Design a protein around this ligand. Structure first.
Ligand code: 56L
Ligand code: 56L
Lengths: 162, 162
């Protein structure tokens, strides 16, 4: 079942989401199903549970470099060095827009697959950026607050910057 | 003649516009005509020449508190105190969006009416904010770069903040 993606300015994107506590359950499976489905319908590479107004530390991400299709509960992130990298990010809570955002090039993330199995990965580049971006959603941060160069912020169909 | 309003992300909104040097002329009158017309069609309270891709220190503004209908060339602004005031601002180069932006509560602005007569005014509150906002356009600054509180940034139809 496809869910409405809420847009920037919604108070619900600004919350700090509580942990998931129903790993392995049918409700959680149903919710992640919806998430992958909602993510695909809107052509996303990542979708955070608060983006569909579900107050939970949950995210889906991935696509066929490649990023494996992943559903991740109770994510926690650790930078693995100090190297930052700039890259384009947009939001499906922010459609038509994008900026360049600096992110850690290298991370580890830890949490749980929906069935309860632990997931820990080192990720880098785009993979890392996706996870940092979705993680922001879980603590009520959005990308505009992370823009260092405002010349790069603007609408998708218009934007001209390197 | 109504003109296309260019959107955020257009390189042309980032320029520093040269001065107007054809005061009193038919071309300038025609251009300001267009500006008022373009401003009314898009329901604006202010319109800067770079917003229609005309690289010039020119702006139109006003509506029937009230702000007198004004066309202003070669604007220069001076804050009259240090008091800042927060208020909602959106852009017609940025449609569907708004944030709260701090601006000087009190200013003087100086320049020229399109016929060459000098214009100098003290303005305050909304009047002042409009002029500061349009002025930003003339130096290639947009409101997002002026947001201090990102909880207030979002889409018009959605936004919930005081
Ligand atoms: C970084 C990636 C392109 C990213 C994004 O920009 N926007 C949403 S909504 N999810 C994401 O994972
Ligand atoms: C401050 C005023 C509401 C303002 C604006 O927010 N956006 C445009 S495009 N012009 C303006 O004068």
């Amino acid at each position: 079942m496809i869910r409405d993606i809420i847009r920037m300015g919604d108070k619900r994107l600004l919350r700090v989401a509580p942990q998931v506590t129903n790993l392995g359950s049918a409700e959680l499976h149903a919710l992640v199903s919806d998430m992958f489905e909602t993510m695909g319908a809107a052509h996303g590479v990542g979708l955070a549970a608060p983006q569909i107004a579900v107050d939970l530390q949950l995210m889906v991400f991935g696509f066929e470099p490649a990023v494996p299709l992943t559903a991740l509960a109770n994510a926690q992130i650790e930078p693995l060095s100090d190297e930052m990298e700039n890259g384009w990010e947009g939001c499906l809570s922010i459609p038509g827009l994008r900026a360049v955002i600096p992110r850690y090039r290298y991370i580890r993330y830890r949490g749980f697959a929906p069935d309860g199995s632990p997931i820990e990965r080192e990720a880098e580049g785009f993979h890392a950026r996706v996870v940092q971006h979705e993680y922001d959603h879980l603590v009520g941060r959005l990308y505009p607050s992370r823009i260092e160069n405002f010349d790069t912020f603007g609408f998708d169909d218009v934007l001209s910057y390197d």
